[PDB]
């Protein structure tokens, strides 16, 4: 037959005379040559729309493929520009390949910023790493208030891409924009001699999600959590300061000896270049104090799904935390029901009906329904938080069994 | 008898049988004294034999005390100027009759100093917490010694027996005495609990690398530095109620408190909230500043004069509470060193002056001090083994 093939980047389409015994590096040889162009075709793969999937293995033929005549598929390069919204709320150009797993996508995102363990991260649908800098006006805030209802954030936790499959295949175009997220709220090993993306970014998703009331506080807590804003601030400041600012002589700070090997305007500097050094990790210890005191607020590390359980009178909420299950109100937020992770032994989905259910110790077992999207996504979210639990190299294929 | 009381300074003779009990005598003095005042302070004491007469109920029988004998009748509470580690001079009054280690706690639960057992006293309300920088450099090079390794072991027998009490060992009132921290071994450095003694523990390590009572690099020095300078900047941030940078507190907190509060109320709560953030940012600036001053390859040594087993000259015995070192003399060297954590016992002969270590595995160590050492020495390394066992 007649294969259609769209070259996206060059705005042509091609016909080409097929018989399915053709393999698939032969039509991208086809291709090339019936175009007659002088061009760099190494990032270039097949992509089939119309069933949602890449063509990557080259030696396969189109029958095993199961392309059917008239079929109008695509030639684009796997690599393809995207907006990122940080937990700073800054948005940032990235080029990403679209063919790779969300799951790499993001480590190799991570490993461009500089942030440890990207298995904590995700991405989720609708220089400039470290520093952290407060709003202008209190309307900015006001502007980027949401409803923040607790319905409303089950909805948007529809939105975390599955991390087995690529960007590509799940809506994902490009020059879109998505939300790169610390879905995971167990963070292993936050060393301030390494993470200082990792520990600003994990600071400016505890304080937007303060300042914007998804997770609730106490009046004096929310005071405490401005007051370490003001010191944050402040330390920061203190950074970028080489003068002296204080009544304090900087000869009174060292050893006589060194009032004899220097001169007064030599030391100062060479203090003032130390100092730099000290209220940077002043600064931050201080956005850890913050994220510390973020970890141990009530409502904490839950992550919400609309549900219905098995003797339920309406729409309820499936909670997911690192070490539990719990079953919620969608009115009030107050726990119905508890599971343990520690106690859980297998868990398994129904697609047919789409439910959930997971067996635990002393023979209980908790089952729910979810609707078809979210249940692809609890069965990640479970998964993932299990094999975060074995942290002690990622194991990626086991990442993928668990999840998958 | 000859008893002299001290306050009032007059002598008074006392016909005694010596069958009468201390307490007895306390009576007698007081009668035959005629004067209004309070005698709750005072008890007996004579320098002859080196002994309090605390225990009224004994006789002067078996007191051994004999006739004529040069008793004095002094108040036990004297005036005692201490150096703090700060370097400044506190004057306070504690029992000369208690042993030098309830002494101890009992100034270090004064200055609201917790653990007294790593503090002790050594031989030459408000300004506990408050730690400011030399205004000149002058005042250092002033309070710059030598401090040669020789003559920190030749201070370190100044470190008083706890065991005794002040009167005993060449203590009189007025004079001044050094707070210190003894032993190296920081046991729950609490800033919720420790505010006055985190301060002088930062004290001391400030002023032993100003000084060079102990060694640093260049770049450990202006670490160091810069360390105190940020403290500093902490400390006058703890002072303050006012805004000090371009932020508007009110983009600090969620909206719905811009609806409850007015700008003011909004400013002063934030600023009360960061003086208590800045006043925990002030302490724990100041553990980092002894963590790195712990950190240091000559933390935590004291230095006794030790002649050892194939000894040439006087050597060093070195220490710590993690292991004791012999060491040279005059660089300061580590010879070689032996770890508490495989120590089996140790014991001193008193006639030779030689205290011996035993270790696991057949190790021995044997060396020879000054008689006044010994006994320091003795003290330094129980001290060590029981606050090894802290829990």
């Given at each position: 037959?007649?294969?259609?093939?769209?070259?996206?980047?060059?705005?042509?389409?091609?016909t080409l005379?097929?018989?399915?015994?053709?393999?698939?590096?032969?039509?991208?040889?086809?291709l090339?040559?019936?175009?007659?162009?002088?061009?760099?075709?190494?990032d270039?793969?097949?992509?089939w729309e119309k069933?949602?999937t890449?063509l990557?293995?080259?030696?396969?033929?189109?029958?095993?493929?199961?392309?059917?005549?008239?079929?109008?598929?695509?030639?684009?390069?796997?690599?393809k520009?995207?907006?990122?919204?940080?937990?700073?709320?800054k948005?940032?150009?990235?080029?990403?390949?679209?063919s790779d797993?969300?799951?790499?996508?993001?480590s190799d995102?991570?490993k461009?910023?500089?942030?440890?363990?990207?298995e904590?991260?995700?991405?989720?649908?609708?220089?400039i790493?470290?520093?952290s800098?407060?709003?202008?006006s209190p309307?900015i805030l006001?502007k980027?208030?949401?409803p923040?209802?607790?319905?409303?954030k089950?909805?948007?936790?529809?939105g975390?891409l599955?991390?087995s499959?690529?960007?590509?295949?799940?809506?994902?175009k490009?020059?879109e924009a998505?939300?790169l997220?610390?879905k995971?709220?167990?963070?292993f090993?936050?060393?301030p001699?390494?993470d200082?993306?990792?520990?600003?970014?994990?600071?400016?998703?505890?304080?937007?999600?303060?300042?914007?009331?998804?997770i609730?506080?106490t009046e004096?807590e929310m005071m405490?959590?401005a007051?370490?804003?003001?010191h944050i601030?402040?330390?920061?400041?203190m950074?970028?300061?080489n003068?002296?600012?204080?009544?304090?002589?900087?000869?009174?700070?060292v050893?006589?000896r060194?009032?004899?090997?220097?001169?007064?305007?030599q030391?100062?500097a060479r203090?003032?270049?130390?100092?730099?050094n000290?209220?940077?990790?002043?600064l931050?210890?201080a956005?850890?104090?913050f994220?510390?005191?973020?970890?141990?607020l009530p409502?904490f590390?839950?992550?919400?799904?609309?549900?219905?359980?098995?003797?339920?009178?309406?729409?309820?909420l499936?909670?997911?935390?690192?070490?539990?299950?719990?079953?919620?109100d969608?009115?009030t937020?107050?726990?119905?029901?508890?599971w343990?992770?520690?106690?859980?032994?297998?868990?398994?989905?129904?697609?047919e009906?789409?439910?959930?259910?997971?067996?635990?110790?002393?023979?209980?077992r908790?089952?729910?329904?979810?609707?078809?999207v979210?249940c692809?996504?609890?069965?990640?979210?479970?998964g993932?938080?299990?094999?975060?639990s074995?942290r002690?190299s990622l194991?990626?294929e086991?990442?993928?069994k668990l999840?998958?």
């Amino acid at each position: 037959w007649e294969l259609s093939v769209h070259v996206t980047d060059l705005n042509r389409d091609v016909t080409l005379r097929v018989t399915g015994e053709v393999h698939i590096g032969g039509v991208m040889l086809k291709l090339v040559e019936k175009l007659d162009v002088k061009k760099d075709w190494s990032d270039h793969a097949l992509w089939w729309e119309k069933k949602r999937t890449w063509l990557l293995k080259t030696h396969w033929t189109l029958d095993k493929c199961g392309i059917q005549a008239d079929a109008k598929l695509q030639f684009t390069p796997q690599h393809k520009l995207l907006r990122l919204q940080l937990p700073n709320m800054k948005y940032v150009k990235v080029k990403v390949n679209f063919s790779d797993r969300v799951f790499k996508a993001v480590s190799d995102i991570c490993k461009t910023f500089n942030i440890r363990h990207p298995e904590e991260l995700s991405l989720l649908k609708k220089g400039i790493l470290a520093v952290s800098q407060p709003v202008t006006s209190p309307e900015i805030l006001a502007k980027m208030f949401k409803p923040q209802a607790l319905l409303d954030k089950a909805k948007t936790n529809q939105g975390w891409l599955d991390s087995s499959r690529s960007l590509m295949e799940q809506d994902v175009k490009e020059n879109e924009a998505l939300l790169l997220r610390f879905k995971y709220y167990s963070f292993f090993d936050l060393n301030p001699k390494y993470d200082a993306i990792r520990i600003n970014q994990l600071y400016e998703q505890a304080k937007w999600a303060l300042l914007l009331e998804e997770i609730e506080c106490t009046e004096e807590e929310m005071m405490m959590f401005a007051a370490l804003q003001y010191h944050i601030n402040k330390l920061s400041i203190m950074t970028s300061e080489n003068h002296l600012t204080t009544d304090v002589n900087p000869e009174c700070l060292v050893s006589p000896r060194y009032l004899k090997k220097y001169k007064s305007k030599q030391i100062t500097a060479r203090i003032l270049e130390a100092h730099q050094n000290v209220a940077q990790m002043s600064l931050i210890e201080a956005k850890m104090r913050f994220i510390q005191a973020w970890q141990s607020l009530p409502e904490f590390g839950i992550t919400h799904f609309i549900a219905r359980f098995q003797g339920g009178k309406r729409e309820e909420l499936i909670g997911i935390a690192y070490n539990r299950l719990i079953r919620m109100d969608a009115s009030t937020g107050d726990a119905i029901k508890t599971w343990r992770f520690s106690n859980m032994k297998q868990w398994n989905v129904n697609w047919e009906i789409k439910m959930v259910t997971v067996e635990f110790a002393d023979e209980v077992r908790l089952s729910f329904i979810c609707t078809e999207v979210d249940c692809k996504v609890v069965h990640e979210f479970i998964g993932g938080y299990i094999f975060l639990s074995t942290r002690a190299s990622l194991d990626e294929e086991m990442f993928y069994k668990l999840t998958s």
